[PDB]
From Swiss-Prot, chain B:
The gene is Zbp1. Residues 1-58 form the Z-binding domain. Ubiquitinated; polyubiquitinated following influenza A virus (IAV) infection. Phosphorylated. The chain holds residues 12 to 69 of 411 of the full protein. Induction: Expression is activated by IRF1. Up-regulated following interferon treatment. By lipopolysaccharides (LPS). It is found in: Cytoplasm; Nucleus. It comes from Mus musculus (Mouse). There is a cross-link at residues 6, 32 (Glycyl lysine isopeptide (Lys-Gly) (interchain with G-Cter in ubiquitin)). This is Z-DNA-binding protein 1. Expressed in lung, spleen and liver. Lower levels were seen in heart, kidney and testis. Expression is greatly up-regulated in tumor stromal cells and activated macrophages. Homodimer. Interacts (via RIP homotypic interaction motif) with RIPK3; leading to RIPK3 activation and necroptosis; interaction is enhanced by CASP6. Interacts (via RIP homotypic interaction motif) with RIPK1. Component of the AIM2 PANoptosome complex, a multiprotein complex that drives inflammatory cell death (PANoptosis).
Length: 59, 58
DNA sequence: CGCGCG
DNA sequence: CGCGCG
């Protein structure tokens, strides 16, 4: 909920590919918690993964 | 035996490749816990996985 | 080592 | 859906 927003703001504010570890530092939650949200957000086509470990706004 | 000698004993008695699920039913512990020990054993050369999801002694 | 796995 | 991951 809150995490999805923060994840989306961080992606949006960068505007390009962002490494998962950059999200760990910014959102301050484990990679598993991030990936769970991120992979559900690519399914919804709200984010893309340009390469493994990297995430980008829009899908 | 955290779980280790039972796994080794089960594989030993069977003599052949054993499916991870047969190990779930036999040891009565989760797949993850079994895989943690199985992959440790594999790296110590104590078991092998001849095909995905199968395990055997040696 | 990518891992999200329900 | 293989997943063990430390």
């Amino acid at each position: 909920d809150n995490l999805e927003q923060k994840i989306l703001q961080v992606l949006s504010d960068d505007g390009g590919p962002v490494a998962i570890f950059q999200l760990v530092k910014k959102c301050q939650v484990p990679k598993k918690t991030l990936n769970q949200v991120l992979y559900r957000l690519k399914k919804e086509d709200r984010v893309s993964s340009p390469s493994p470990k990297y995430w980008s706004i829009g899908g």
